[PDB]
Structure 1
Amino acid sequence: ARVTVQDAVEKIGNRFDLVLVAARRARQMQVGGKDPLVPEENDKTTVIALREIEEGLINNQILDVRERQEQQEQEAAEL
């Protein structure tokens, strides 16, 4: 269980962008097979997204950077 999320609301301000960033990160870790950047221990996708937030490495601008790099390297074999 994870009791609080008050650390994320400082890492991703405003506490609503936290929910949106975590929604997208969990869906990205559960729909498209992606490696959690954090040791999973029997824990659902939502909490793993939160823990990734608290390590300061989700940070929606970060997710957008990484997904643009994905689009590029996905369009690298785009010919």
Structure 2
Amino acid sequence: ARVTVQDAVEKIGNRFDLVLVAARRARQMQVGGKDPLVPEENDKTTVIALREIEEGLINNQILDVRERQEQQEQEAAEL
């Protein structure tokens, strides 16, 4: 569980792009079969995305490059 998103916004100094990136992460977790990298503690997707951002391993750049790589092996799937 979480109460505040302070450390997250020192991680992402926008307070607005943070919502967008964590929303994309939550969308990946729900719509897709993406496994959250931080193991949940009976937490919802919208708060586990903020937990992922808190550890600093998930933000706009890493999310963008990760989805780009997934698309790359999506073209490469059919060779």
Interval containing the TM-score (normalised by the shorter chain): over 0.9
In structure 1, list runs of 5 or more residues that go unmatched. none
Q: CA deviation at 1:78?
A: 3.2
Moved over 3 A (4+): none
| TM-score, normalised with respect to structure 2 | 0.94
In structure 2, list runs of 5 or more residues that go unmatched. none
Q: CA deviation at 1:44?
A: 0.3
Listed one character per residue, the Cα deviations across residues 21-77 of structure 1 (whole Å, up to 9, x for unaligned) are 111000111110101010111100011100000000111011000000000111111
Find the aligned partners of 2:37 and 2:11 in 1 and give their Cα distance.
16
| TM-score, normalised with respect to structure 1 | 0.94
Find the aligned partners of 1:17 and 1:78 in 2 and give their Cα distance.
35
Q: 1 or 2, which has the higher helix percentage?
A: 2
Aligned counterparts, 1:1-79, within 5 A: 1-79=1-79
Aligned residue pairs total 79
